[PDB]
Amino acid sequence: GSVKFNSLDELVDYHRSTSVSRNQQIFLRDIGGGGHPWYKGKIPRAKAEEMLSKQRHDGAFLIRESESAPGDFSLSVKFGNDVQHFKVLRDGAGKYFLWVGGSGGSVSSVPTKLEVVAATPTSLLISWDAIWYPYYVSYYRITYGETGGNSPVQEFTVPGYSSTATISGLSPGVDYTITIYAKYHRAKYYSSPISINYRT
Amino acid sequence: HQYYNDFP
């Protein structure tokens, strides 16, 4: 998933009017004679940033053959400050696209449900819903400790392909604050948190 | 070798 194109021409045409960025409004725009508007064949990545350094306008772009992944294509794009490189994904039938999945109809990277599925007096099974590009989370950090004072909160990470976790070795009768941080690939920062309370 | 739309 989700939107897929039968060819490079068709991918290019779609991303003239739909952003290539999940957060910003960045549309593909031709480099400023009689040659192909945007394909540059087997040309290197340093070179692609040479052809795009001289563009002031957002969305300047070419598509080159990929260096690190022969037979694949790369899409190079100017984003105000920097030159960004996209990998052109192919699916099972060899359709082309840029992003697996989609937002949730959501505008934030914070997990949206966080719930206790089942519980004993010394353990928790919890679940959550990441709807914003779940395929792009590298891992979740789960923290838990007594609500209020005092000691170190306990932490562990579960892989991004996971939607549930198990918390163990808890004291009966204690109120816990349970929190989850999403770490997208590759955001600089964890996403901001979502937490829950539960008393064993 | 690193791309803006990579996977984990």
Where among A45, A78, A103 does a domain terminate? A103
Query: What single string gives the DSSP state of each residue in A158-178?
Result: EETT--EEEE-SPPTT-EEEE
- Write out the H or E segment, with its range, that includes residue A146: strand A137-146
Q: Are A188 and A132 found together in one domain?
A: yes
Residues of B whose CB is below 8 A from A138: 8
Strands (E) located in A23-136 = 29-30, 60-65, 73-79, 82-87, 89-90, 96-97, 113-120, 123-129
CATH of the domain at A142: 2.60.40.10
Where among A103, A128, A161 does a domain terminate? A103
Q: What residue type is assigned to position A16 of the chain?
A: R
Residues of A whose CB is below 8 A from B1: 67-68
Measure CA of the first residue to CA of the last residue in chain B; give whole Å.
Answer: 14
**What is the number of other CB atoms lying within 10 angstroms of the CB of residue A114?**
18
> What is the structure's resolution, reported in angstroms to one decimal?
2.4
The experimental technique behind this entry is X-ray
Write out the two tokens for A69: 């992944």
Residues of A whose CB is below 8 A from B5: 86-87, 89, 98-99
**Is the preceding peptide bond at A2 cis, omega within 30 degrees of 0?**
yes
Distance from C-alpha of A158 to C-alpha of A174, rounded to nearest angstrom: 24
Q: Does A160 touch chain B (CB under 8 A)?
A: yes
Tokens 């508007």, residue located:
A37
Write out the two tokens for A97: 């696209």
DSSP 8-state assignment for residue A80 = T
**Which residues form the domain of A165?**
104-200
How far, in whole angstroms, is CA A59 from its chain's centroid? 20
Say whether B8 and A99 touch across the interface (CB within 8 A). Answer: no
Q: Are A1 and A99 found together in one domain?
A: yes
Q: Does A135 touch chain B (CB under 8 A)?
A: yes
